[PDB]
Protein backbone atom coordinates (compact mmCIF):
# COMPACT_ATOMS: atom_id res chain seq x y z
CA UNK A 1 0.00 0.00 0.00
CA UNK A 2 2.52 2.60 -1.18
CA UNK A 3 1.68 5.67 -3.27
CA UNK A 4 4.84 7.54 -4.28
CA UNK A 5 4.57 10.56 -6.58
CA UNK A 6 6.63 10.25 -9.77
CA UNK A 7 7.04 13.38 -11.88
CA UNK A 8 8.59 12.46 -15.22
CA UNK A 9 10.07 14.69 -17.91
CA UNK A 10 10.99 13.80 -21.48
CA UNK A 11 13.04 16.43 -23.31
CA UNK A 12 14.22 15.80 -26.86
CA UNK A 13 16.57 17.96 -28.91
CA UNK A 14 16.85 16.78 -32.52
CA UNK A 15 18.77 19.79 -33.75
CA UNK A 16 19.38 23.46 -32.93
CA UNK A 17 15.96 24.17 -34.47
CA UNK A 18 13.73 21.38 -33.14
CA UNK A 19 13.03 20.66 -29.46
CA UNK A 20 10.21 19.05 -27.44
CA UNK A 21 9.60 18.90 -23.69
CA UNK A 22 6.75 16.81 -22.26
CA UNK A 23 5.88 15.49 -18.81
CA UNK A 24 3.79 13.14 -16.67
CA UNK A 25 2.82 12.73 -13.03
CA UNK A 26 2.01 9.34 -11.50
CA UNK A 27 0.50 8.77 -8.09
CA UNK A 28 1.04 5.08 -7.55
CA UNK A 29 -0.09 3.36 -10.74
CA UNK A 30 -2.48 6.16 -11.74
CA UNK A 31 -1.54 9.13 -13.93
CA UNK A 32 -2.76 12.34 -12.28
CA UNK A 33 -1.29 14.94 -14.66
CA UNK A 34 -0.18 15.59 -18.24
CA UNK A 35 2.21 18.24 -19.57
CA UNK A 36 2.48 18.99 -23.29
CA UNK A 37 4.96 21.13 -25.25
CA UNK A 38 1.93 22.57 -27.05
CA UNK A 39 0.17 23.54 -23.81
CA UNK A 40 0.91 26.59 -21.66
CA UNK A 41 -0.19 24.78 -18.48
CA UNK A 42 -0.16 21.37 -16.77
CA UNK A 43 -3.40 19.47 -17.41
CA UNK A 44 -5.19 17.71 -14.54
CA UNK A 45 -6.43 14.23 -15.43
CA UNK A 46 -8.46 13.61 -12.27
CA UNK A 47 -10.99 15.56 -10.16
CA UNK A 48 -8.65 15.16 -7.19
CA UNK A 49 -5.44 15.96 -9.13
CA UNK A 50 -5.13 19.34 -7.42
CA UNK A 51 -5.55 17.72 -4.01
CA UNK A 52 -6.19 20.13 -1.16
CA UNK A 53 -4.14 22.91 -2.76
CA UNK A 54 -5.93 26.21 -3.38
CA UNK A 55 -6.07 27.90 -6.78
CA UNK A 56 -3.39 30.35 -5.68
CA UNK A 57 -1.12 27.48 -4.64
CA UNK A 58 -1.66 25.65 -7.92
CA UNK A 59 -1.05 28.85 -9.87
CA UNK A 60 2.26 29.36 -8.04
CA UNK A 61 3.34 25.87 -9.11
CA UNK A 62 2.02 26.47 -12.63
CA UNK A 63 4.19 29.59 -12.92
CA UNK A 64 7.34 27.78 -11.79
CA UNK A 65 6.99 24.92 -14.28
CA UNK A 66 6.27 27.36 -17.10
CA UNK A 67 9.44 29.31 -16.33
CA UNK A 68 11.38 26.08 -15.74
CA UNK A 69 10.66 24.63 -19.18
CA UNK A 70 11.78 27.81 -20.95
CA UNK A 71 15.05 28.16 -19.04
CA UNK A 72 15.86 24.44 -19.20
CA UNK A 73 15.64 24.47 -23.00
CA UNK A 74 17.72 27.64 -23.20
CA UNK A 75 20.35 26.42 -20.73
CA UNK A 76 20.80 23.00 -22.33
CA UNK A 77 21.13 24.40 -25.86
CA UNK A 78 23.83 26.89 -24.83
CA UNK A 79 25.62 24.37 -22.61
CA UNK A 80 25.71 21.90 -25.49
CA UNK A 81 27.16 24.62 -27.73
CA UNK A 82 29.95 25.41 -25.26
CA UNK A 83 31.02 21.76 -25.05
CA UNK A 84 30.52 20.98 -28.75
CA UNK A 85 28.07 18.21 -27.82
CA UNK A 86 26.62 16.42 -30.84
CA UNK A 87 22.86 16.43 -31.42
CA UNK A 88 20.48 14.68 -30.99
CA UNK A 89 20.15 15.09 -27.22
CA UNK A 90 17.79 13.09 -25.02
CA UNK A 91 17.21 14.23 -21.44
CA UNK A 92 15.00 12.57 -18.84
CA UNK A 93 14.01 13.76 -15.37
CA UNK A 94 12.44 11.66 -12.63
CA UNK A 95 11.48 13.50 -9.45
CA UNK A 96 8.96 13.32 -6.61
CA UNK A 97 8.47 12.02 -3.09
CA UNK A 98 6.72 9.50 -0.85
CA UNK A 99 4.77 10.07 2.36
CA UNK A 100 5.26 7.76 5.35
CA UNK A 101 2.90 6.95 8.31
CA UNK A 102 5.04 8.94 10.77
CA UNK A 103 4.53 12.27 8.96
CA UNK A 104 8.02 11.71 7.54
CA UNK A 105 8.84 11.71 3.83
CA UNK A 106 11.62 10.94 1.36
CA UNK A 107 12.19 12.53 -2.04
CA UNK A 108 14.33 12.14 -5.15
CA UNK A 109 15.53 14.10 -8.18
CA UNK A 110 17.20 12.16 -10.99
CA UNK A 111 18.49 13.24 -14.40
CA UNK A 112 19.51 10.95 -17.25
CA UNK A 113 21.41 11.77 -20.44
CA UNK A 114 21.03 9.49 -23.47
CA UNK A 115 19.47 6.79 -21.29
CA UNK A 116 22.30 6.78 -18.75
CA UNK A 117 22.31 8.29 -15.25
CA UNK A 118 24.40 11.45 -15.00
CA UNK A 119 23.49 13.48 -11.90
CA UNK A 120 20.98 13.70 -9.06
CA UNK A 121 19.88 16.12 -6.34
CA UNK A 122 20.85 14.93 -2.87
CA UNK A 123 20.05 17.11 0.13
CA UNK A 124 21.10 20.68 -0.59
CA UNK A 125 23.34 19.99 -3.61
CA UNK A 126 23.70 18.21 -6.95
CA UNK A 127 26.05 15.22 -7.26
CA UNK A 128 27.25 13.15 -10.26
CA UNK A 129 27.02 9.39 -10.72
CA UNK A 130 30.33 7.52 -10.48
CA UNK A 131 30.36 6.83 -14.20
CA UNK A 132 29.48 10.12 -15.87
CA UNK A 133 31.15 12.20 -18.57
CA UNK A 134 33.69 14.58 -17.04
CA UNK A 135 31.80 17.63 -18.33
CA UNK A 136 28.83 16.83 -16.08
CA UNK A 137 30.76 18.46 -13.23
CA UNK A 138 30.69 21.75 -15.16
CA UNK A 139 26.89 21.70 -15.16
CA UNK A 140 26.82 20.79 -11.47
CA UNK A 141 29.06 23.61 -10.19
CA UNK A 142 26.83 26.01 -12.13
CA UNK A 143 23.65 24.44 -10.73
CA UNK A 144 25.08 24.61 -7.21
CA UNK A 145 25.86 28.33 -7.42
CA UNK A 146 22.28 28.96 -8.51
CA UNK A 147 20.42 30.03 -5.37
CA UNK A 148 17.00 30.24 -6.99
CA UNK A 149 17.22 26.79 -8.57
CA UNK A 150 18.77 25.15 -5.50
CA UNK A 151 16.20 26.52 -3.04
CA UNK A 152 13.15 26.09 -5.29
CA UNK A 153 13.95 22.43 -5.91
CA UNK A 154 14.24 21.90 -2.15
CA UNK A 155 11.00 23.81 -1.62
CA UNK A 156 9.26 21.61 -4.18
CA UNK A 157 10.69 18.29 -3.02
CA UNK A 158 10.74 18.79 0.74
CA UNK A 159 8.28 21.63 1.35
CA UNK A 160 5.53 21.23 -1.22
CA UNK A 161 5.41 17.67 -2.60
CA UNK A 162 4.77 15.93 0.75
CA UNK A 163 1.86 18.28 1.50
CA UNK A 164 0.69 17.84 -2.09
CA UNK A 165 0.78 14.04 -1.95
CA UNK A 166 -1.01 14.04 1.41
CA UNK A 167 -3.78 16.07 -0.20
CA UNK A 168 -4.02 13.70 -3.15
CA UNK A 169 -4.33 10.65 -0.90
CA UNK A 170 -7.11 12.25 1.12
CA UNK A 171 -9.05 13.76 -1.78
CA UNK A 172 -8.67 10.78 -4.11
CA UNK A 173 -9.08 8.13 -1.42
CA UNK A 174 -12.24 6.63 -2.96
CA UNK A 175 -10.64 5.91 -6.34
CA UNK A 176 -7.20 4.89 -5.04
CA UNK A 177 -8.67 2.07 -2.94
CA UNK A 178 -11.02 0.91 -5.72
CA UNK A 179 -11.42 -2.80 -6.39
CA UNK A 180 -11.73 -4.15 -9.94
CA UNK A 181 -12.65 -7.80 -10.43
CA UNK A 182 -10.51 -9.84 -12.86
CA UNK A 183 -11.92 -11.91 -15.72
CA UNK A 184 -10.33 -15.18 -16.82
CA UNK A 185 -10.32 -17.34 -19.95
CA UNK A 186 -8.29 -20.35 -21.06
CA UNK A 187 -6.30 -21.15 -24.20
CA UNK A 188 -3.86 -23.71 -25.61
CA UNK A 189 -0.78 -23.33 -27.82
CA UNK A 190 1.43 -26.04 -29.39
CA UNK A 191 4.54 -26.63 -27.27
CA UNK A 192 8.16 -26.48 -28.44
CA UNK A 193 8.42 -30.16 -27.51
CA UNK A 194 6.45 -32.50 -29.78
CA UNK A 195 3.59 -34.42 -28.18
CA UNK A 196 2.92 -31.60 -25.73
CA UNK A 197 0.67 -28.58 -25.26
CA UNK A 198 1.03 -25.30 -23.38
CA UNK A 199 -2.04 -24.06 -21.52
CA UNK A 200 -2.52 -20.31 -21.14
CA UNK A 201 -4.59 -18.79 -18.34
CA UNK A 202 -5.50 -15.18 -19.10
CA UNK A 203 -6.37 -12.76 -16.30
CA UNK A 204 -7.49 -9.23 -17.20
CA UNK A 205 -9.26 -6.18 -15.81
CA UNK A 206 -8.07 -6.30 -12.20
CA UNK A 207 -6.87 -3.73 -9.66
CA UNK A 208 -5.03 -3.21 -7.39
CA UNK A 209 -1.94 -4.92 -8.82
CA UNK A 210 -1.28 -7.77 -6.34
CA UNK A 211 -2.80 -11.00 -7.64
CA UNK A 212 -2.44 -14.78 -7.23
CA UNK A 213 -2.69 -17.06 -10.27
CA UNK A 214 -1.90 -20.78 -10.26
CA UNK A 215 -2.71 -23.83 -12.39
CA UNK A 216 -4.20 -26.58 -10.23
CA UNK A 217 -5.35 -30.18 -10.35
CA UNK A 218 -7.71 -30.73 -7.44
CA UNK A 219 -6.36 -29.13 -4.27
CA UNK A 220 -2.77 -29.68 -5.43
CA UNK A 221 -0.97 -26.75 -7.06
CA UNK A 222 0.97 -27.38 -10.27
CA UNK A 223 4.56 -26.27 -9.69
CA UNK A 224 5.16 -25.83 -13.41
CA UNK A 225 3.02 -22.69 -13.48
CA UNK A 226 4.92 -19.83 -15.12
CA UNK A 227 3.76 -16.28 -14.35
CA UNK A 228 4.32 -13.58 -16.95
CA UNK A 229 4.74 -9.80 -16.89
CA UNK A 230 2.02 -7.36 -15.87
CA UNK A 231 0.63 -5.70 -19.00
CA UNK A 232 -1.37 -2.46 -18.62
CA UNK A 233 -4.92 -2.09 -19.87
CA UNK A 234 -5.82 1.42 -21.04
CA UNK A 235 -8.77 1.54 -18.60
CA UNK A 236 -6.33 1.60 -15.63
CA UNK A 237 -6.51 -2.11 -14.88
CA UNK A 238 -3.91 -4.87 -15.19
CA UNK A 239 -3.54 -7.86 -17.52
CA UNK A 240 -1.61 -11.04 -16.69
CA UNK A 241 -1.27 -14.56 -18.10
CA UNK A 242 0.01 -17.81 -16.61
CA UNK A 243 1.28 -20.79 -18.60
CA UNK A 244 1.61 -24.51 -17.92
CA UNK A 245 3.38 -27.16 -19.98
CA UNK A 246 1.54 -30.49 -20.04
CA UNK A 247 1.49 -33.65 -22.15
CA UNK A 248 -1.35 -33.98 -24.66
CA UNK A 249 -4.36 -35.65 -23.06
CA UNK A 250 -3.43 -34.54 -19.55
CA UNK A 251 -5.48 -31.34 -19.96
CA UNK A 252 -8.68 -32.73 -18.43
CA UNK A 253 -9.01 -32.15 -14.68
CA UNK A 254 -6.82 -29.05 -14.71
CA UNK A 255 -8.12 -25.68 -13.57
CA UNK A 256 -6.82 -22.13 -13.19
CA UNK A 257 -7.34 -20.61 -9.74
CA UNK A 258 -7.24 -16.84 -9.25
CA UNK A 259 -7.08 -15.03 -5.90
CA UNK A 260 -7.67 -11.28 -5.72
CA UNK A 261 -8.79 -8.68 -3.16
CA UNK A 262 -11.80 -7.72 -5.30
CA UNK A 263 -13.23 -11.25 -5.36
CA UNK A 264 -14.77 -11.05 -1.89
CA UNK A 265 -12.79 -13.93 -0.43
CA UNK A 266 -13.83 -16.37 -3.15
CA UNK A 267 -11.29 -17.55 -5.71
CA UNK A 268 -12.02 -17.75 -9.43
CA UNK A 269 -11.72 -21.39 -10.49
CA UNK A 270 -11.71 -22.02 -14.23
CA UNK A 271 -11.83 -25.64 -15.41
CA UNK A 272 -10.45 -26.77 -18.78
CA UNK A 273 -13.16 -27.00 -21.46
Amino acid sequence: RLFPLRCLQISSFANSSWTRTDGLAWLGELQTHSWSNDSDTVRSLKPWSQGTFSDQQWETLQHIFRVYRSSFTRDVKEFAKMLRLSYPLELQVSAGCEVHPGNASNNFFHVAFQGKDILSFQGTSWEPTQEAPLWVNLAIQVLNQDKWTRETVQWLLNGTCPQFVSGLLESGKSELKKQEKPVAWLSSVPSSAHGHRQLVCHVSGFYPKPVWVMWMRGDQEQQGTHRGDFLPNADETWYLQATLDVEAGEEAGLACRVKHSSLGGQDIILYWS
Partner: single-chain antibody
Amino acid sequence: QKVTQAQSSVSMPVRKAVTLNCLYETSWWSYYIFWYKQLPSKEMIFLIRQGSDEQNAKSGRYSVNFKKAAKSVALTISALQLEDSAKYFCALGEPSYWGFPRTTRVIFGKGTRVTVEPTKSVIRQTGSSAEITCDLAEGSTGYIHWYLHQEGKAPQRLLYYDSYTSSVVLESGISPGKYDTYGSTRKNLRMILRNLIENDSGVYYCATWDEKYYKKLFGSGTKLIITD
Protein backbone atom coordinates in the same frame (compact mmCIF):
# COMPACT_ATOMS: atom_id res chain seq x y z
CA GLN B 1 5.64 46.80 6.59
CA LYS B 2 8.08 44.73 4.53
CA VAL B 3 11.11 45.56 6.69
CA THR B 4 10.70 46.73 10.29
CA GLN B 5 13.44 48.26 12.42
CA ALA B 6 11.68 49.19 15.65
CA GLN B 7 14.61 51.00 17.28
CA SER B 8 14.87 54.58 16.04
CA SER B 9 17.99 55.43 18.06
CA VAL B 10 20.54 53.52 20.14
CA SER B 11 23.48 54.78 22.22
CA MET B 12 26.29 52.53 23.44
CA PRO B 13 29.75 53.06 25.01
CA VAL B 14 32.99 52.34 23.14
CA ARG B 15 34.51 48.84 23.43
CA LYS B 16 31.10 47.31 24.09
CA ALA B 17 28.56 45.49 21.92
CA VAL B 18 25.30 46.65 20.36
CA THR B 19 22.53 44.62 18.72
CA LEU B 20 20.15 46.04 16.11
CA ASN B 21 16.79 44.37 15.50
CA CYS B 22 15.18 43.83 12.10
CA LEU B 23 11.92 42.07 11.22
CA TYR B 24 10.91 41.22 7.65
CA GLU B 25 7.85 39.94 5.79
CA THR B 26 8.13 37.80 2.66
CA SER B 27 6.10 34.99 1.10
CA TRP B 28 9.05 33.77 -0.97
CA TRP B 29 10.99 30.64 -0.04
CA SER B 30 14.28 32.12 -1.24
CA TYR B 31 15.63 35.56 -0.34
CA TYR B 32 18.60 37.70 0.70
CA ILE B 33 18.97 39.96 3.72
CA PHE B 34 21.45 42.84 3.61
CA TRP B 35 22.79 45.16 6.29
CA TYR B 36 23.98 48.62 5.28
CA LYS B 37 25.71 51.47 7.08
CA GLN B 38 25.13 55.16 6.33
CA LEU B 39 27.99 57.41 7.43
CA PRO B 40 27.50 61.08 8.42
CA SER B 41 29.01 61.79 4.99
CA LYS B 42 25.85 60.05 3.71
CA GLU B 43 28.02 57.31 2.22
CA MET B 44 26.12 54.01 2.00
CA ILE B 45 28.36 51.06 2.88
CA PHE B 46 27.66 47.32 2.61
CA LEU B 47 28.29 45.35 5.80
CA ILE B 48 27.04 41.76 5.67
CA ARG B 49 24.71 39.45 3.73
CA GLN B 50 22.40 36.78 5.15
CA GLY B 51 21.08 34.08 2.85
CA SER B 52 17.70 32.50 3.56
CA ASP B 53 19.11 28.98 3.24
CA GLU B 54 22.47 29.80 4.84
CA GLN B 55 23.61 29.67 8.46
CA ASN B 56 24.20 32.74 10.63
CA ALA B 57 26.52 35.09 8.77
CA LYS B 58 29.73 36.33 10.37
CA SER B 59 32.04 38.93 8.85
CA GLY B 60 34.67 40.69 10.97
CA ARG B 61 33.00 42.46 13.88
CA TYR B 62 29.63 42.03 12.17
CA SER B 63 27.50 38.99 12.99
CA VAL B 64 23.92 38.10 12.08
CA ASN B 65 21.53 36.13 14.27
CA PHE B 66 19.08 34.54 11.85
CA LYS B 67 15.77 33.14 13.06
CA LYS B 68 13.91 32.00 9.96
CA ALA B 69 10.74 31.01 11.82
CA ALA B 70 10.19 34.42 13.41
CA LYS B 71 11.60 36.12 10.31
CA SER B 72 13.98 37.95 12.63
CA VAL B 73 17.43 38.96 11.41
CA ALA B 74 19.49 41.02 13.84
CA LEU B 75 22.89 42.63 13.34
CA THR B 76 25.39 42.66 16.19
CA ILE B 77 28.54 44.78 16.21
CA SER B 78 31.14 43.24 18.52
CA ALA B 79 33.58 45.90 19.70
CA LEU B 80 32.25 49.37 19.00
CA GLN B 81 34.66 51.97 17.69
CA LEU B 82 34.17 55.71 17.15
CA GLU B 83 33.86 55.25 13.39
CA ASP B 84 30.95 52.88 14.05
CA SER B 85 28.63 55.83 14.68
CA ALA B 86 26.17 55.81 11.78
CA LYS B 87 22.65 54.91 10.70
CA TYR B 88 22.30 51.18 10.05
CA PHE B 89 19.83 49.84 7.50
CA CYS B 90 18.28 46.39 7.23
CA ALA B 91 17.39 45.41 3.67
CA LEU B 92 15.66 42.52 1.88
CA GLY B 93 16.23 41.35 -1.69
CA GLU B 94 13.22 39.46 -3.05
CA PRO B 95 13.32 37.23 -6.16
CA SER B 96 10.86 36.72 -8.99
CA TYR B 97 9.83 33.48 -10.72
CA TRP B 98 12.88 34.20 -12.88
CA GLY B 99 15.22 34.11 -9.87
CA PHE B 100 17.39 37.08 -8.91
CA PRO B 101 17.79 39.39 -11.94
CA ARG B 102 20.01 42.46 -11.78
CA THR B 103 16.77 44.44 -12.09
CA THR B 104 16.00 43.46 -8.49
CA ARG B 105 15.08 46.30 -6.13
CA VAL B 106 16.31 46.41 -2.54
CA ILE B 107 13.77 47.15 0.20
CA PHE B 108 15.01 49.21 3.15
CA GLY B 109 13.91 49.62 6.74
CA LYS B 110 13.71 53.16 8.11
CA GLY B 111 17.08 52.59 9.78
CA THR B 112 18.54 52.88 13.27
CA ARG B 113 20.93 55.60 14.42
CA VAL B 114 23.81 54.25 16.49
CA THR B 115 25.79 56.70 18.60
CA VAL B 116 29.06 55.43 20.06
CA GLU B 117 29.84 57.48 23.16
CA PRO B 118 33.46 58.01 24.35
CA THR B 119 30.31 63.46 -2.05
CA LYS B 120 28.69 66.52 -3.63
CA SER B 121 26.25 69.06 -2.17
CA VAL B 122 23.80 70.85 -4.45
CA ILE B 123 21.40 73.71 -3.71
CA ARG B 124 18.54 74.75 -6.00
CA GLN B 125 15.43 76.94 -5.95
CA THR B 126 11.82 75.79 -6.31
CA GLY B 127 10.83 75.53 -9.97
CA SER B 128 14.33 74.89 -11.29
CA SER B 129 16.07 71.66 -12.28
CA ALA B 130 19.14 69.67 -11.24
CA GLU B 131 21.51 66.99 -12.52
CA ILE B 132 22.72 64.20 -10.25
CA THR B 133 25.90 62.55 -11.52
CA CYS B 134 26.70 58.89 -10.90
CA ASP B 135 30.24 57.82 -10.09
CA LEU B 136 30.51 54.04 -10.09
CA ALA B 137 33.49 52.00 -11.27
CA GLU B 138 32.11 48.50 -10.75
CA GLY B 139 30.48 46.06 -11.06
CA SER B 140 27.54 45.90 -13.43
CA THR B 141 26.92 48.28 -16.31
CA GLY B 142 23.76 46.30 -17.16
CA TYR B 143 21.26 48.14 -14.97
CA ILE B 144 21.88 51.41 -13.13
CA HIS B 145 19.52 52.02 -10.22
CA TRP B 146 18.64 55.33 -8.57
CA TYR B 147 17.69 55.51 -4.90
CA LEU B 148 16.35 58.40 -2.81
CA HIS B 149 16.79 58.77 0.94
CA GLN B 150 14.86 61.33 2.96
CA GLU B 151 15.21 61.65 6.74
CA GLY B 152 12.42 59.92 8.64
CA LYS B 153 11.77 57.55 5.75
CA ALA B 154 13.31 54.39 4.32
CA PRO B 155 15.41 54.69 1.14
CA GLN B 156 13.31 54.12 -1.99
CA ARG B 157 14.29 53.22 -5.53
CA LEU B 158 13.01 55.88 -7.91
CA LEU B 159 13.89 54.08 -11.14
CA TYR B 160 16.55 52.20 -13.08
CA TYR B 161 18.08 52.46 -16.54
CA ASP B 162 17.86 49.42 -18.79
CA SER B 163 20.88 49.40 -21.11
CA TYR B 164 19.49 46.41 -23.00
CA THR B 165 16.31 48.25 -24.00
CA SER B 166 18.02 51.66 -23.75
CA SER B 167 15.05 52.94 -21.72
CA VAL B 168 14.07 54.11 -18.24
CA VAL B 169 11.89 51.99 -15.96
CA LEU B 170 10.00 54.01 -13.33
CA GLU B 171 8.76 52.52 -10.06
CA SER B 172 5.02 52.28 -9.45
CA GLY B 173 3.46 55.58 -8.39
CA ILE B 174 6.04 57.91 -9.92
CA SER B 175 4.71 60.35 -12.52
CA PRO B 176 6.70 60.42 -15.79
CA GLY B 177 8.43 63.69 -16.66
CA LYS B 178 9.81 64.12 -13.16
CA TYR B 179 12.99 62.09 -13.67
CA ASP B 180 15.06 61.13 -16.70
CA THR B 181 18.56 59.89 -17.51
CA TYR B 182 21.20 60.98 -20.02
CA GLY B 183 24.39 59.08 -20.84
CA SER B 184 25.96 55.67 -21.36
CA THR B 185 26.84 52.86 -18.94
CA ARG B 186 30.08 54.82 -18.47
CA LYS B 187 30.29 57.25 -15.54
CA ASN B 188 28.88 60.01 -17.77
CA LEU B 189 25.36 58.81 -16.86
CA ARG B 190 23.32 61.35 -14.90
CA MET B 191 19.78 61.71 -13.58
CA ILE B 192 17.84 64.89 -14.32
CA LEU B 193 15.27 66.22 -11.86
CA ARG B 194 12.70 68.55 -13.39
CA ASN B 195 10.35 71.07 -11.76
CA LEU B 196 11.88 70.93 -8.28
CA ILE B 197 9.71 71.29 -5.20
CA GLU B 198 10.77 71.36 -1.54
CA ASN B 199 9.84 67.70 -1.04
CA ASP B 200 12.52 66.67 -3.54
CA SER B 201 15.17 67.42 -0.89
CA GLY B 202 17.22 64.42 0.19
CA VAL B 203 20.15 62.16 -0.68
CA TYR B 204 20.30 60.60 -4.14
CA TYR B 205 22.25 57.39 -4.76
CA CYS B 206 23.15 55.55 -7.94
CA ALA B 207 23.37 51.79 -7.48
CA THR B 208 24.28 48.56 -9.29
CA TRP B 209 24.54 44.87 -8.42
CA ASP B 210 28.12 43.63 -8.05
CA GLU B 211 29.34 41.03 -10.56
CA LYS B 212 31.56 38.84 -8.36
CA TYR B 213 29.47 38.81 -5.17
CA TYR B 214 25.74 39.45 -5.07
CA LYS B 215 25.10 42.72 -3.25
CA LYS B 216 23.86 46.21 -4.09
CA LEU B 217 26.70 48.71 -4.44
CA PHE B 218 25.76 52.33 -3.80
CA GLY B 219 27.74 55.24 -5.20
CA SER B 220 28.56 58.41 -3.31
CA GLY B 221 25.29 60.10 -2.37
CA THR B 222 24.40 63.55 -3.65
CA LYS B 223 22.82 65.92 -1.15
CA LEU B 224 20.12 68.05 -2.75
CA ILE B 225 18.85 71.02 -0.75
CA ILE B 226 15.86 72.86 -2.17
CA THR B 227 14.74 76.28 -0.94
CA ASP B 228 11.59 78.27 -1.65
